[PDB]
Amino acid sequence: TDSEKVAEYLRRATLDLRAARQRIRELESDPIAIVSMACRLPGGVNTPQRLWELLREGGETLSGFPTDRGWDLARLHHPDPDNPGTSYVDKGGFLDDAAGFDAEFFGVSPREAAAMDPQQRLLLETSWELVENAGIDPHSLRGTATGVFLGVAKFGYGEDTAAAEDVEGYSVTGVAPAVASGRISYTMGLEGPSISVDTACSSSLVALHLAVESLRKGESSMAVVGGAAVMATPGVFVDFSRQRALAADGRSKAFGAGADGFGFSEGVTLVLLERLSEARRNGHEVLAVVRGSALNQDGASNGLSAPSGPAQRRVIRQALESCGLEPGDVDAVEAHGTGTALGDPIEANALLDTYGRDRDADRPLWLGSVKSNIGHTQAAAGVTGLLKVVLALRNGELPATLHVEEPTPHVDWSSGGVALLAGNQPWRRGERTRRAAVSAFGISGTNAHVIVEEAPEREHRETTAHDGRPVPLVVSARTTAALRAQAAQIAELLERPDADLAGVGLGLATTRARHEHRAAVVASTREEAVRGLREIAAGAATADAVVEGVTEVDGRNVVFLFPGQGSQWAGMGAELLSSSPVFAGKIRACDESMAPMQDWKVSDVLRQAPGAPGLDRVDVVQPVLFAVMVSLAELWRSYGVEPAAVVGHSQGEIAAAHVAGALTLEDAAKLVVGRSRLMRSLSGEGGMAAVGEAAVRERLRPWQDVAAVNGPRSVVVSGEPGALRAFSEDCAAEGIRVRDIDVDYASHSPQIERVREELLETTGDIAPRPARVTFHSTVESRSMDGTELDARYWYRNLRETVRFADAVTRLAESGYDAFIEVSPHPVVVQAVEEAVEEADGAEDAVVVGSLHRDGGDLSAFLRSMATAHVSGVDIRWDVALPGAAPFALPTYPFQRKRYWLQP
């Protein structure tokens, strides 16, 4: 009615208003989470943990000049501050040797690797480490919309050397700021925008602001924000010593007596950013959150490179207003202090003017710096300050600044608004939310201020699911040495008292990319896993529960095989039934489908229950084998291995018919039961023998009884007992070995003709349906259809020979490479391997069984799966690990080599 539709319109208007306001808020200000970080810093620091330890303990990283870079150390040093071409400063914080690199991992000709400056190499390594640390498989990032923003300079590597053969143009592209991010995106295969920016020594925060804006707009889904600065020539030192703007001992003493120049240092630092909602929805880890930022310029001020207080006050107020907060909601501020005798007083006065005014007397703002123990880092200053703030938030402590024992008399600390950090002070999580600010000032006159806030409450929800079940471990690398180093790392990590085996397994399974060289170990106890890892890291692997291989392709066409009689070994399972739920469910369903006609249950026979039929009977051999085979096929399919082709053999073809989907389970079970019941009557009229096809064919001339051929030397002969015995004695006289098979008749012989049409009455109502797989018959050696199977086809199958080898060779020539068996015991693996080798197909063909006569446990199945996986077949291991949680893991063990350009 009218009122109903008017009320509906009112409701729609209200809902749309809510949505519009929410969208406006999302576009204006949306929290952005920090996922992970990576860094390389002087003093042998390459992990955030080491940096936090150094900051908390309290220490410096001062050092002497490098030597491998070829600098003229003897002549460069001179005590005269006015001597041209020299400097009066010899100490400094110099980063670890940069000539190391692993060109083969990324893939680069050694000449090109020598061409590139160390900045791009370190950027590549740090980017890979950063991606790995976040818990994201790097190969999963291909084709996404990830963007790169970073601050790079042109310090001047590799210009003294003259030009040479450069047809590839390596020299031009080696040293260029844009090419750095270009190469990063090219190697990682990203597709978002790539930006290289540089604004004095505050470039990193500008890049962070740009990335935040891009993420809020929605143009990109991920952001990689970083800064890099590595010196190559000592020209910068001479240039700055010309101005006498360097400390006497190279120590930065921000906010303290005896302020001097700023010590110099190198470093690279990157972080990964994503929207808070997306990170929460995707289950990533959140460490902190960024609220807002602001930018401005000093404008017309005294001189060119001189700080301006009003600009800093305005930018701080702008950032605070943009965040929608109040100045009384900040606990600590990471100040930008280079130790200069002029910038520090004005910076501190501005900070006291803005935050200090109206500050609570009992809650002073804590002031500190990071450069007091690592020195200036040029474009990487802001990101390093953010790193320190993040670490302090995570550990709940505030590191104390150094060289502060007499505060600068210019700054009036008597107001009490701002308190200077002296010793470590606890900052544990409590009621009031914890926040911090980071500021950065550039030489060109640009200013940046960023507000960071603690992560929300942890979800917790910690559960345990380890029950002693077997666990697989997979390792992979692009080189043998790298593989061994990774194995050693995992082995030493597993010895911790925690040693969450399920967590380590899951992390190895679903966080690290798989490379050419692969290896796997299946273990159920920590001691045996450590033993296997030590063995594989030793260089030579001999243990059975240890597999390894080399593979290039990452996708194979799968063909299932269903061999006939031959395995029938007492006990099919009795350990899977308890463990595997899918296997037990399939067995129970198959038993219920065929339950009507007979009485004894398949499960009871398998479980060796008392009062069950013995295994020496056709009526119990056939359906039990069929059920076991179909259950094993279902179990294999449960791990994401869908067969592209299906091949049967003898009665196994029936099981194949069910795998192809061309028949119903009940109808197939009825067929098997009827065949067994009709055939059991024809007992004691023949036998099989295994043994030169033409030679054996012509040797059968004296008699009138050939069963199947499975290879060049795989010949099966079915014959009447008298003539079979005579031929066996003749072969024994010849000396060629002959083995009989467990059978009370001779199938595919004239004995089959006795029943013949009697099968037809028992084989009515066999209405088939089209099959979604490529079932290929071994009788006609031709691909079949979903309706060509009839009682006539089954009778023909029970009467003619099998050209199994011909079908195998045809499939091998077709293009299929992955061959996998299903029977409880392998009986055809050797013949299939020989036939594949004799064919002209690819040499990457893989043949692997399912179980073994002695090995019938879930561990054996996992070992077979690992053997198939290390050769190229895709396997989703995470299914085998239910209810597990990930774990922290070490990064890739690069194999570095020296690559430097000697002037």
Short mmCIF file of C-alpha atoms in Angstrom, two decimals, residues 570-720:
data_model
loop_
_atom_site.label_atom_id
_atom_site.label_comp_id
_atom_site.label_asym_id
_atom_site.label_seq_id
_atom_site.Cartn_x
_atom_site.Cartn_y
_atom_site.Cartn_z
CA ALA A 570 46.93 -60.39 4.72
CA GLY A 571 45.76 -57.16 6.33
CA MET A 572 44.68 -54.16 4.25
CA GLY A 573 44.95 -51.29 6.69
CA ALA A 574 43.95 -51.86 10.34
CA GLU A 575 45.82 -48.60 10.99
CA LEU A 576 44.22 -46.31 8.41
CA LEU A 577 40.76 -47.28 9.68
CA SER A 578 41.52 -45.80 13.09
CA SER A 579 43.43 -42.84 11.65
CA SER A 580 41.96 -41.98 8.25
CA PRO A 581 38.29 -40.96 8.47
CA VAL A 582 37.79 -40.71 4.71
CA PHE A 583 39.05 -44.26 4.14
CA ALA A 584 36.78 -45.67 6.85
CA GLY A 585 33.79 -43.72 5.54
CA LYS A 586 34.30 -44.94 1.98
CA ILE A 587 34.75 -48.53 3.16
CA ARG A 588 31.57 -48.35 5.24
CA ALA A 589 29.59 -46.82 2.37
CA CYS A 590 30.81 -49.49 -0.04
CA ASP A 591 29.90 -52.20 2.47
CA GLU A 592 26.40 -50.79 2.91
CA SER A 593 25.89 -50.53 -0.86
CA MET A 594 26.70 -54.23 -1.35
CA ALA A 595 25.41 -55.36 2.06
CA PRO A 596 22.07 -56.87 0.79
CA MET A 597 23.15 -59.93 -1.20
CA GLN A 598 25.80 -61.32 1.16
CA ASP A 599 26.24 -61.30 4.94
CA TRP A 600 29.92 -60.98 5.87
CA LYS A 601 31.21 -57.42 6.16
CA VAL A 602 34.35 -56.18 4.42
CA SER A 603 35.45 -54.28 7.53
CA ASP A 604 35.27 -57.43 9.65
CA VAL A 605 37.47 -59.29 7.15
CA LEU A 606 39.96 -56.41 7.11
CA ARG A 607 39.99 -56.11 10.91
CA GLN A 608 40.81 -59.85 11.19
CA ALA A 609 37.71 -60.31 13.34
CA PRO A 610 36.99 -63.87 14.52
CA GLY A 611 34.37 -65.80 12.61
CA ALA A 612 35.17 -64.21 9.25
CA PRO A 613 35.78 -65.85 5.86
CA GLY A 614 39.38 -66.67 5.04
CA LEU A 615 41.13 -64.71 2.32
CA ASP A 616 41.57 -67.84 0.16
CA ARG A 617 38.35 -67.54 -1.81
CA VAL A 618 37.41 -65.72 -5.01
CA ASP A 619 34.14 -64.45 -3.50
CA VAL A 620 36.20 -62.75 -0.78
CA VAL A 621 39.24 -61.83 -2.89
CA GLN A 622 37.35 -59.84 -5.52
CA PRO A 623 35.01 -57.44 -3.65
CA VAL A 624 37.51 -56.80 -0.85
CA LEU A 625 40.18 -55.82 -3.37
CA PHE A 626 37.70 -53.64 -5.26
CA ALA A 627 36.64 -51.82 -2.09
CA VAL A 628 40.25 -51.33 -0.97
CA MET A 629 41.22 -49.94 -4.38
CA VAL A 630 38.33 -47.49 -4.61
CA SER A 631 38.90 -46.32 -1.03
CA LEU A 632 42.59 -45.74 -1.73
CA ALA A 633 41.72 -43.81 -4.89
CA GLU A 634 39.33 -41.62 -2.90
CA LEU A 635 42.01 -41.04 -0.26
CA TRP A 636 44.48 -39.99 -2.95
CA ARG A 637 41.90 -37.63 -4.45
CA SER A 638 41.27 -36.14 -1.01
CA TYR A 639 44.72 -34.48 -1.16
CA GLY A 640 43.96 -32.48 -4.30
CA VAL A 641 45.27 -34.95 -6.90
CA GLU A 642 42.65 -35.27 -9.64
CA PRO A 643 43.59 -37.95 -12.21
CA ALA A 644 43.65 -36.72 -15.80
CA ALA A 645 43.54 -40.28 -17.16
CA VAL A 646 42.48 -43.66 -15.77
CA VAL A 647 43.78 -47.09 -16.80
CA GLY A 648 42.54 -50.41 -15.45
CA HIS A 649 43.79 -53.98 -15.69
CA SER A 650 41.62 -57.10 -15.60
CA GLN A 651 38.94 -56.84 -12.91
CA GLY A 652 40.63 -53.65 -11.72
CA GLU A 653 39.07 -51.99 -14.75
CA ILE A 654 35.75 -52.27 -12.90
CA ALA A 655 37.20 -50.08 -10.16
CA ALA A 656 38.48 -47.77 -12.89
CA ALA A 657 34.93 -47.65 -14.24
CA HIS A 658 33.80 -46.28 -10.88
CA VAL A 659 36.66 -43.78 -10.71
CA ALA A 660 35.77 -42.43 -14.15
CA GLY A 661 32.21 -41.95 -12.87
CA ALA A 662 30.65 -44.05 -15.64
CA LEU A 663 28.98 -46.44 -13.17
CA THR A 664 27.13 -46.39 -9.87
CA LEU A 665 28.80 -47.91 -6.82
CA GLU A 666 25.91 -50.31 -6.19
CA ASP A 667 25.86 -51.52 -9.80
CA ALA A 668 29.63 -52.05 -9.81
CA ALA A 669 29.45 -53.98 -6.55
CA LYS A 670 26.68 -56.16 -7.97
CA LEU A 671 28.80 -56.78 -11.07
CA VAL A 672 31.80 -57.82 -8.98
CA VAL A 673 29.74 -60.12 -6.77
CA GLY A 674 28.04 -61.73 -9.76
CA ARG A 675 31.32 -62.27 -11.59
CA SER A 676 32.92 -63.83 -8.51
CA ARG A 677 29.93 -66.09 -7.84
CA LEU A 678 29.76 -67.27 -11.45
CA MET A 679 33.53 -67.80 -11.69
CA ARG A 680 34.04 -69.67 -8.40
CA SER A 681 32.26 -72.66 -9.94
CA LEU A 682 34.90 -72.83 -12.69
CA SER A 683 37.69 -73.80 -10.30
CA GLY A 684 40.62 -76.13 -10.85
CA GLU A 685 40.71 -75.89 -14.65
CA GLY A 686 43.84 -73.82 -15.30
CA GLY A 687 46.58 -71.63 -13.95
CA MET A 688 48.82 -68.65 -14.59
CA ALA A 689 52.54 -68.40 -15.23
CA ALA A 690 54.86 -65.40 -15.53
CA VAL A 691 57.81 -65.35 -17.91
CA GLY A 692 60.61 -62.90 -26.00
CA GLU A 693 56.92 -62.76 -26.86
CA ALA A 694 57.44 -64.45 -30.23
CA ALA A 695 59.58 -67.20 -28.69
CA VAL A 696 56.99 -68.11 -26.06
CA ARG A 697 54.22 -67.79 -28.66
CA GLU A 698 55.88 -70.34 -30.94
CA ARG A 699 56.82 -72.55 -27.98
CA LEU A 700 53.09 -73.03 -27.26
CA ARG A 701 52.56 -74.84 -30.58
CA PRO A 702 52.74 -78.40 -29.12
CA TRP A 703 49.82 -77.48 -26.81
CA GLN A 704 46.58 -75.52 -27.18
CA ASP A 705 46.49 -73.26 -24.12
CA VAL A 706 48.92 -66.84 -23.32
CA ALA A 707 47.13 -64.57 -20.85
CA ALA A 708 48.51 -61.03 -21.06
CA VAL A 709 51.59 -58.98 -21.95
CA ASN A 710 52.68 -56.09 -19.72
CA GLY A 711 56.07 -55.33 -21.28
CA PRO A 712 58.88 -56.50 -23.55
CA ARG A 713 59.67 -59.32 -21.10
CA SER A 714 56.40 -59.26 -19.10
CA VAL A 715 54.48 -62.26 -20.47
CA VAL A 716 51.58 -64.04 -18.77
CA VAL A 717 50.54 -67.54 -19.87
CA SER A 718 47.21 -69.11 -18.87
CA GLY A 719 46.88 -72.84 -19.38
CA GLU A 720 45.33 -76.11 -18.35
#
